[PDB]
Design a binder for these strands. Structure first.
Ligand SMILES: Nc1ccn([C@H]2C[C@H](O)[C@@H](COP(=O)(O)NP(=O)(O)OP(=O)(O)O)O2)c(=O)n1
Ligand SMILES: [Mg+2]
Ligand SMILES: [Mg+2]
Length: 431
DNA sequence: ATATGACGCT
DNA sequence: AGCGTCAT
């Protein structure tokens, strides 16, 4: 009827840096540019664990979480950059500082939600509307969109080359555009995409880093759109593109469906693709997955989703962690204390930096451990008051709240051994 | 032998 | 409060 909300109220973008840690290393070491390379942690065991892979090394099948020694068998020319190590653990400061560079540039254009070290959602609804009153009724030239793909286009009688494809779809999209109607959702996305071109040009201009972006009407679609044409390209996913796109879209590819919920949707409903969800009533979906999940699934498979872009570029928690897999699991009281102290010393540096930059203090310390055999991330979390940014107090207090977990008759020893220590400062207060 | 961060459920 | 899910 005339009372159907199509989920086209917003223009939302998601910007994600291309092989981000690699780009940070490649900017600093020009010998690594335009080469198969990867960023690795801890060179001692099997060459180090790979955490980021350039697109040149991906062409050989090198992936994240692979051992560097194994990646070298797939790609003998692979160059490696090692993560900084401080206090016997990985130190990600260089990438956090690179991340702040990118976030501050994006923040100049619109309200952003920091979503990870290398990505942020952008709510462009206001910027698009303002622009719709300033760029006048002046048409949108294809030159304003030199790196944009229109998902689903070109269609019909028109190639062979990807940029030929990109242009043809953009041409079909822009020819079909009704610019005399400032409330066309498709025109709004187009203006959003122009804006995202400009903010991606600014990021590259001011940092050297390339990135990809999705532009659509909500966070889920924008994130999906972002990966469609990685790297160094952006993708507009219109409401109209959703039925064809979702008809062969595996369910696990949708944000929040990559885990157990996504698996249960597939197993319980007997489907493979996002589009098959539309044949179920909302009540049926709620009967299987809960009121909130069923409702979310019912709207989402029609391309509709209402999670807002939260105005937040600052983390809500600040944390330091280290895993101790296998025979490295911590098995004496001295080890636990020493590592807690190493974690607390890095955390104190980060928190002091945070308070000076951001006018806030953390008030609660969360201590998370994992014990050997437990396959869950955390086996146990406990908390106490974070009153002084003092590493020796924080490490001692963290020890106080977990020391009863030790079921060891001998007091020098720690049993069962700990496979993870994690200190997280939270409950930030205005200061 | 897979360093962190956001959040939901009870 | 403490645990579970989902994610980069
Ligand atoms: N488990 C993980 C996942 C990502 N990261 C770091 C390394 C990544 O370069 C950076 C961003 O992760 P990402 O966006 O998922 N993939 P990345 O940016 O490396 O390549 P793209 O696939 O986005 O082009 O977070 C990590 O340190 N541990
Ligand atoms: Mg990325
Ligand atoms: Mg990312």
């Amino acid at each position: 009827g005339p009372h159907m909300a199509t989920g086209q109220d917003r223009v939302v973008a998601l910007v994600d840096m291309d092989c981000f840690f690699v780009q940070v290393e490649q900017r600093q070491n020009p010998h690594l540019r335009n080469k198969p390379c990867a960023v690795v942690q801890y060179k001692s065991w099997k060459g180090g664990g790979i955490i980021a892979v350039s697109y040149e090394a991906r062409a050989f099948g090198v992936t994240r979480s692979m051992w560097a020694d194994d990646a070298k068998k797939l790609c003998p020319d692979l160059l490696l950059a090692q993560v900084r190590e401080s206090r016997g653990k990985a130190n990600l400061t260089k990438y956090r500082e690179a991340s702040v560079e990118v976030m501050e540039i994006m923040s100049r254009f619109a309200v952003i939600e920091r979503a990870s070290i290398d990505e942020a959602y952008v709510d462009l609804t206001s910027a698009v509307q303002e622009r719709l009153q300033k760029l006048q009724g002046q048409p949108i030239s294809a030159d304003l969109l030199p790196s944009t793909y229109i998902e689903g286009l070109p269609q019909g009688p028109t190639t062979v080359q990807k940029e030929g494809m990109r242009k043809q779809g953009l041409f079909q999209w822009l020819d079909s555009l009704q610019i005399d109607n400032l409330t066309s959702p498709d025109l709004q996305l187009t203006v959003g995409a122009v804006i995202v071109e400009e903010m991606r040009a600014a990021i590259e201009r001011e940092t050297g880093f390339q990135c990809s972006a999705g532009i659509s009407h909500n966070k889920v679609l924008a994130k999906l759109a972002c990966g469609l044409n990685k790297p160094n390209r952006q993708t507009l996913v219109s409401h109209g593109s959703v039925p064809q796109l979702f008809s062969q879209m595996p369910i696990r590819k949708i944000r929040s469906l990559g885990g157990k919920l996504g698996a249960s949707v597939i197993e319980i409903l007997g489907i493979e693709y996002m589009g098959e969800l539309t044949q179920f009533t909302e009540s049926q979906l709620q009967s299987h997955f809960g009121e909130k999940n069923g409702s979310w699934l019912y709207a989402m498979c029609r391309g509709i989703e209402h999670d807002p872009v939260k105005p937040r570029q600052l983390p809500k928690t600040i944390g330091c962690s280290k895993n101790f897999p296998g025979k490295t699991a911590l098995a004496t009281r001295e080890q636990v204390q020493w590592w807690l102290l190493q974690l607390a010393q890095e955390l104190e540096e980060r928190l002091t930096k945070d308070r000076n930059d951001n006018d806030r203090v953390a008030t609660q310390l969360v201590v998370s451990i994992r014990v050997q055999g437990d396959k869950r991330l955390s086996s146990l979390r406990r908390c106490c008051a974070l009153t002084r940014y003092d590493a020796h107090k924080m490490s001692h207090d963290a020890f106080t709240v977990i020391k009863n977990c030790n079921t060891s008759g001998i007091q020098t020893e720690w049993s069962p051994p700990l496979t993870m220590l994690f200190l997280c400062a939270t409950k930030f207060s205005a200061s």
